[PDB]
């Protein structure tokens, strides 16, 4: 006859890498700016001063 490995001795391998879901970022980052006519206004004044 022919020698075969036991059913419980069949090795399964696992990968250390993983996939990530695809997420749409909206594209708003292109509209952010500190200029007066920016579609989205960025006010970073509270990063140096105090207040909520």
């Amino acid at each position: 006859a022919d020698t075969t490995p036991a059913t419980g001795l069949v090795v399964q391998q696992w990968e250390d890498k993983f996939f990530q879901e695809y997420l749409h970022d909206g594209g708003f980052k292109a509209l952010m700016g500190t200029d007066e006519n920016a579609v989205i206004q960025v006010k970073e004044d509270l990063s140096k001063k105090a207040g909520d």
Partner: protein
Amino acid sequence: SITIALVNRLNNAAVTGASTLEGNEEDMTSRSLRIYVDKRRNAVRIAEISEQRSAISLRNAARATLLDWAMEDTRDLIIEALGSLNGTRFVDRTAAIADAWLVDNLDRVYFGAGVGSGTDLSADLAQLDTSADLFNVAALDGMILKAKTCNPKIRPMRDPGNGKRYYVAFANPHAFKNLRDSMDNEYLSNTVVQMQASKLFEGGDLMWNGVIVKETDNIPIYENLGAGGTAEVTPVYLCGAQALAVAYAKRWKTVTEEFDYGDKYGVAVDGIYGVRKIIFGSGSGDTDDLKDHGVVTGFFATTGAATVAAAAAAEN
């Protein structure tokens, strides 16, 4: 076998103010897919007297035919994996498996002209008639919309710029001809783009809404799966990034062996590998409600000759 993993996104509301974050952490979810491999071989044996008698070189012919057979086997395995229902071959599908797959993948399945219910696959295929349920631009646009609205989004194969998302569709020559008949006198003959206009005469892979449609001659045509039990049905596969997975325990390799004191000479091609369609669960369990990760399948009626027998393509 080899197991690959997918990590689901976090969808928990932010902890605002001074509220404690310790003990209120988000439960990360992961999914796994197991891909098996198998050994596939073929061989050709030639006698020395037959080598002497033959006018052509039989060894070179054997090597070339073995290489072609290996390529054909890989292509057939990939095509078969593309049409697998939860890892089960389409011709070997059952009613329960097909119904579960249709229910759990209703956001990635688009029948012709956007018809079909959400409970039974057999009835949905039986709603396909050759008159209005062919493969056209409208069906392709609906399939593209499906690829962009599924709960786990399908990754485009490329993100070249401003809102452009690219995918690759595989279709039979008959479905490709139907798409060309839909595209020829409406958009291809009137567009000012030279590259797309030239495709009307020098036919090739088409482009529509960012999807590159390719003509693969070996996509099966299932027999008597359409309206009235007499209409042929063909699947079209719209794939993005991470659509199929190929595991290679041993690549295609050729060996030679001698038999009968060197009288006979045999060439063999062998390889250990396995091709599967990447599917991940969506329910509470790891593989509770499996979903096609990166593939949208569309069944359309056709008038072409069926490559699969009626008994073979039936729901066994």
